[PDB]
Amino acid sequence: KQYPIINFTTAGATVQSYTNFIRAVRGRLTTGADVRHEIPVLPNRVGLPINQRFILVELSNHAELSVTLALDVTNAYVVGYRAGNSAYFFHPDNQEDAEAITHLFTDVQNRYTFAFGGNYDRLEQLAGNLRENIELGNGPLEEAISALYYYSTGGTQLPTLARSFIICIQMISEAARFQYIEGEMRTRIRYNRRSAPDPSVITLENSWGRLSTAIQESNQGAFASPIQLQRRNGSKFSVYDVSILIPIIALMVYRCAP
Numbered sequence: 001k002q003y004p005i006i007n008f009t010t011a012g013a014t015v016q017s018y019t020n021f022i023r024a025v026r027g028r029l030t031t032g033a034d035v036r037h038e039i040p041v042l043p044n045r046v047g048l049p050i051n052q053r054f055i056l057v058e059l060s061n062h063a064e065l066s067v068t069l070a071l072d073v074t075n076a077y078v079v080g081y082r083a084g085n086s087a088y089f090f091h092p093d094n095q096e097d098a099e100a101i102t103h104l105f106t107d108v109q110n111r112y113t114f115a116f117g118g119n120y121d122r123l124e125q126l127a128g129n130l131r132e133n134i135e136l137g138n139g140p141l142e143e144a145i146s147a148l149y150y151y152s153t154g155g156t157q158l159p160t161l162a163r164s165f166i167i168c169i170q171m172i173s174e175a176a177r178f179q180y181i182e183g184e185m186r187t188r189i190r191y192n193r194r195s196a197p198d199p200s201v202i203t204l205e206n207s208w209g210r211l212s213t214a215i216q217e218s219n220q221g222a223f224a225s226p227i228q229l230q231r232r233n234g235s236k237f238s239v240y241d242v243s244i245l246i247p248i249i250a251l252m253v254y255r256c257a258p
């Protein structure tokens, strides 16, 4: 017995198989017994035992390649992955984090830490493309699984590896964080399209920590100051209250209760 594993395959994927997956991911990220204003909070990192810190997400595609992402339950971040006999980790932000990841993928023959960190800014630079120009859907996802798998063999240039991370992160972590983003992926899957996320998706992604804070500091759901988001067409609008976000955000990073 070792960290909980959730499986998804792109082979034959449907909106139901993808929804089932994202639902199970959420269920492993949190027990759900800390909820504020109806929105679940992930476990506080302060004092969480290592043995509860991570979840694994096994990704397969029609080429029958498989990779396994490791996600930090405290924030749903993808911290690294394993493909066959190697495992690779983003460069950690602190020594505590560096220490935690020593506990993942312990039986793998080859382990490495990238010199670069895993935030979108760094990955975009590495990919040489912005999330607004990187396509999402089942096609991109199956392609990103192969790219990640092939990375040890030397088959995959770094820019492509970084694009593939940006895809996985959005289709897995962001979809888990936001029902809105899950729905965005369901739509691409339903119509078998691939398309870049629009400003509504990108600004929600960028605002996740800020939303977690606003809702958690709110006066019974009313934000202490407004949060600006973006519509599909890039126009700015303001959110004042948690009520509107209940069908949009599914999970928040822990902040202490005011």
Ligand SMILES: Nc1nc2nc(C(=O)NCc3ccco3)cnc2c(=O)[nH]1
Binding pocket: 075, 076, 077, 078, 079, 090, 118, 119, 120, 121, 169, 173, 174, 205, 206, 207, 209
């Ligand atoms: N590896 C990884 N990287 C991630 N990077 C981001 C990301 O940059 N967010 C933008 C941001 C705004 C403020 C601070 O930061 C989000 N999720 C993830 C994530 O879930 N896994």
